[PDB]
From Swiss-Prot, chain A:
Anchoring/scaffolding protein that is a part of the functional network formed by USH1C, USH1G, CDH23 and MYO7A that mediates mechanotransduction in cochlear hair cells. Required for normal development and maintenance of cochlear hair cell bundles. As part of the intermicrovillar adhesion complex/IMAC plays a role in brush border differentiation, controlling microvilli organization and length. Probably plays a central regulatory role in the assembly of the complex, recruiting CDHR2, CDHR5 and MYO7B to the microvilli tips. This is Harmonin. Expressed in small intestine, colon, kidney, eye and weakly in pancreas. Expressed also in vestibule of the inner ear. Part of the IMAC/intermicrovillar adhesion complex/intermicrovillar tip-link complex composed of ANKS4B, MYO7B, USH1C, CDHR2 and CDHR5. Part of a complex composed of USH1C, USH1G and MYO7A. Interacts with F-actin. Interacts with USH2A. Interacts with SLC4A7. Interacts (via PDZ1 domain) with the C-terminus of USHBP1. Interacts (via N-terminus and PDZ 2 domain) with CDH23. Interacts with USH1G. Interacts with MYO7B. Interacts with CDHR2 and CDHR5; may mediate their interaction with MYO7B at the microvilli tip. Interacts (via PDZ 1 domain) with ANKS4B. Interacts (via PDZ 1 domain) with DOCK4. Signal peptide: none annotated. It is found in: Cytoplasm, Cytosol; Cytoplasm, Cytoskeleton; Cell projection, Microvillus. It comes from Homo sapiens. GO terms for cellular component: apical part of cell; brush border; cilium; cytoplasm; cytoskeleton; cytosol; microvillus; photoreceptor inner segment. GO terms for molecular function: spectrin binding. Residues 21-104 form the PDZ domain. The keyword Phosphoprotein applies. It comes from the Eukaryota. One of its GO terms (biological process) is retinal cone cell development. Its main location: cytoplasm.
UniProtKB/Swiss-Prot annotation, chain B:
It comes from Homo sapiens (Human). The modification Phosphoserine is found at S22. It is found in: Cytoplasm, Cytoskeleton; Cell projection, Microvillus. The chain holds residues 1607 to 2100 of 2116 of the full protein. It comes from the Eukaryota. This is Unconventional myosin-VIIb.
Length: 119, 467
């Protein structure tokens, strides 16, 4: 997280957060965000997730590849296409004030070997 | 005698010496047709500055890594061919009436790099040819001429010089060998040139190793704890940079190794190509077996451990002296609990003793023959979190092979289901997931960082079956 007092239930219905570890991040605007996204409603995973953290995202910590973006400055984006989510993230970064607020579902630890290299 | 761009400059150069060496930075391009594009003025001038820096003619204190200079000189000329003749003229300019031997030596290194990337255009080629031919006494000049011939034959590079090319250039060395590693813990040095294609390396490897064929094999780059196949039709040095760039984006030149391995396991019949079996196949299949990816009985494991011990140790019966170390190299990790250390040792020694009259090579082939009809033989494996099937465990094992895509229960090793190629209708991947669709049917969705690899293998198998 980046604000401790956040209650997901106050912003989402339980159906929207079932099984998710939902946290609030405040990211200070400096430099470029360099947070890449993938997914979207038009995609097989049906949600917006972080594909790479290159760097304002890297420097904040707290957000990594696989984490889901559920809201941007209070607007819920779980039903956005990828392009819509990128536009909203870029707009939030450019316009507005000193910080952006990202609500994220933190991806849990992997209980599998995600680095097999055999052929 | 010495051929010069003087007369060429009358027709094709800008107007203001200009075709001769100078330490003064250019302010517009040299060629009139490049000069005609104000939008190319800045790149043409930055190229010249980098050339000046590379040859040591830039009175700066901030010294640059050489690869950054060669990237600046050549990268945009590859994308915008209008700049290609400009780079040639800028280099030959600095090589003309250059009375500083260090600078001139460095200029010839740039011409050598350049002729490995793209040729001059039709109109400049006879001038570049005569420039080189009248200076055939310079160390790198004969090879510059040959490289122009070769790049006209194969077509132009897509990526600027690799650090291996630049290090040869800075040594004034035109012959380059690259180490290639094999799955049996050996390596060979392979000669490569600017226009070597991945498949050319493989051809030479198959000769060197006396393989009957390298169909379904390729080069691979081991880099940042990934192992990434190289495209057979690509230029070797283009592939190295393209994959490096990709790794740097998807996750200081990066350390790397190039391996030669089997990629596609199609119609593999152990004993048909014994060299392929004993260099490649045994040593790729052994670690997948030891990881416990196959459904194996205790008696299966005893039998195969006898062959594995023989393949690894030949006649040396002393290495089972300490079971805690060595058992992990002989028995799949899901089965070691099945019997105690001394019972494994006794059983394996009895099995091994049957191979006294076999060679190591014969033991490796026998190991392969005994497992080659298993549905999980000849596979790449992926552990993933699947999110599409409630009745499967969250974490499943996936095999991709000649048969399509297999879903495997990690605890029991049973085959949950098979997606044959003849029934897969689509698949897609991101950096966090892989998805596949069957018929009208069934869908698989899973969390993995290896979607790009699954995609590569599925595409490659489908392409090979279609051909």
């Amino acid at each position: 997280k980046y604000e401790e007092g956040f209650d997901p239930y106050s912003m989402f219905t339980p159906e929207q957060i079932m099984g998710k570890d939902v946290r609030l991040l405040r990211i200070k605007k400096e430099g470029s965000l360099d947070l890449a996204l993938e997914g979207g409603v038009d995609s097989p995973i049906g949600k917006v997730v972080v594909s790479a953290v290159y760097g304002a995202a890297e420097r904040h910590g707290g957000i990594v590849k696989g984490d889901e973006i559920m809201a941007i400055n209070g607007k819920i984006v779980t039903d956005y296409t990828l392009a819509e989510a990128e536009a909203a993230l870029q707009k939030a970064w450019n316009q507005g004030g000193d910080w952006i607020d990202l609500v994220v579902a933190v991806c849990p630890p992997k209980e599998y070997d995600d680095e097999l290299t055999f052929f | 005698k010495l051929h010069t761009l003087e007369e060429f400059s009358y027709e094709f150069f800008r107007a203001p010496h200009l075709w001769a060496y100078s330490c003064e930075p250019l302010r517009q391009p040299l060629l009139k047709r490049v000069h005609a594009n104000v939008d190319l003025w800045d790149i043409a001038c930055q190229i010249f500055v980098a050339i000046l820096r590379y040859m040591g003619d830039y009175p700066s204190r901030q010294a640059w890594p050489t690869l950054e200079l060669t990237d600046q000189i050549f990268t945009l000329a590859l994308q915008h061919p209008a700049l290609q003749d400009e780079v040639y003229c800028q280099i030959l300019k600095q090589l003309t009436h250059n009375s500083n031997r260090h600078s001139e030596e460095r200029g010839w290194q740039l011409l050598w790099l350049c002729t490995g990337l793209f040729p001059p255009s039709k109109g400049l080629l006879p001038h570049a040819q005569k420039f080189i031919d009248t200076r055939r006494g310079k160390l790198l000049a004969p090879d510059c001429s040959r490289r122009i011939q070769k790049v006209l034959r194969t077509g132009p590079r897509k990526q600027p010089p690799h650090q291996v090319e630049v290090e040869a250039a800075e040594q004034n060395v035109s012959r380059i060998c690259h180490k290639i590693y094999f799955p049996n813990d050996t390596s060979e040095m392979l000669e490569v040139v600017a226009n070597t294609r991945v498949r050319d390396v493989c051809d030479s490897i198959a000769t060197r190793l006396q393989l009957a064929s390298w169909e379904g094999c390729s080069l691979f780059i081991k880099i940042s704890d990934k192992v990434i196949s190289q495209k057979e039709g690509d230029f070797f040095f283009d592939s190295l940079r393209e994959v490096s760039d990709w790794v740097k984006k998807n996750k200081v030149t990066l350390p790397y190794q190039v391996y030669f391995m089997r990629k596609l396991w199609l119609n593999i019949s152990p004993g048909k190509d014994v060299n392929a079996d004993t260099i490649l196949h045994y040593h790729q299949e052994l670690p997948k077996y030891l990881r416990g990816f196959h459904k194996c009985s205790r008696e299966d494991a005893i039998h195969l451990a006898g062959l594995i011990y023989k393949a690894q140790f030949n006649n040396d019966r002393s290495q089972l002296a300490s079971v805690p170390k060595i058992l992990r190299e002989l028995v799949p990790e899901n089965l070691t609990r099945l019997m105690s250390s001394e019972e494994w040792k006794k059983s394996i020694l009895l099995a091994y003793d049957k191979h006294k009259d076999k060679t190591v090579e014969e033991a490796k082939v026998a190991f392969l023959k005994w497992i080659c009809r298993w549905p999980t033989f000849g596979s790449a494996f992926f552990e993933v979190k699947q999110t599409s099937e409630p009745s499967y465990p969250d974490v499943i094992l996936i095999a991709i092979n000649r048969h399509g895509v297999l879903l495997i229960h990690p605890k029991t090793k049973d085959l949950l289901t098979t997606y044959p190629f003849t029934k897969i209708s689509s698949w897609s991947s991101g950096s966090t997931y892989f998805h596949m669709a069957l018929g009208s049917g069934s869908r698989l969705l899973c969390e993995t960082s290896l979607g790009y690899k699954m995609d590569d293998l599925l595409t490659s198998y489908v392409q090979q079956l279609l051909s």
